[PDB]
């Protein structure tokens, strides 16, 4: 259908996966916030406006953190939807310290389409952990997500010059550089 109806069944979906998790910030915000504001960082700030790119992301975490496979993605949504949603999804069956090495490792060698995906995703969590420090984390331990937040974000350039400014920015205020 139109560009606004295919977007409604993504969030649609996606709310209804995501249902009944929160985040972590204190207050517990609903975890939709999060696919959505991704994907309005894409339209708002990047310029974005591939539905597939656009779907991918409001759909980034129903893989990873539902029941949700990615044959389901596929059939509502297309391959190419399954496919950039694939590219983003961390493998659940491994340890989170080789999760989060992966991330580092397989940053250069991603489609365009998950970088941009990708660099909204650090560029919400890390605004976010700014905004207010996560339910039983020190103040170290967020400053070490911003250091390995760069580390993925170094993989990441050349997609898109107002994700990467933005993350720029905010890793310099916090003595971090590219
Ligand atoms: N320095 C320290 O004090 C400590 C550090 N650690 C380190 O932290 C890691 C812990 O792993 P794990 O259990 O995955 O915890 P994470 O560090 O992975 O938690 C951060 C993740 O939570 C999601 N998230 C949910 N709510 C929020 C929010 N309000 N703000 C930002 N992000 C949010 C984001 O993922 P998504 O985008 O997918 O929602 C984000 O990537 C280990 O790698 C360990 O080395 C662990 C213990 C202490
Ligand atoms: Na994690
Ligand atoms: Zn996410």
Redesign the pocket.
Known sequence: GSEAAQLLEAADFAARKHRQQR???PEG?PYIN?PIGVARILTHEAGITDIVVLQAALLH?TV??TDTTLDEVELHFGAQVRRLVEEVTDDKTLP??ER?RLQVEQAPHSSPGAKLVKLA?KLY?LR??NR?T?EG??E??VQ??FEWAAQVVKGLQGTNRQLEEALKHLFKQRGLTI
């Open positions: 985040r972590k910030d915000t999060h975490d990873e953190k989170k310290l989060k995703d969590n976010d952990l207010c996560p984390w020190s170290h331990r070490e997500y």
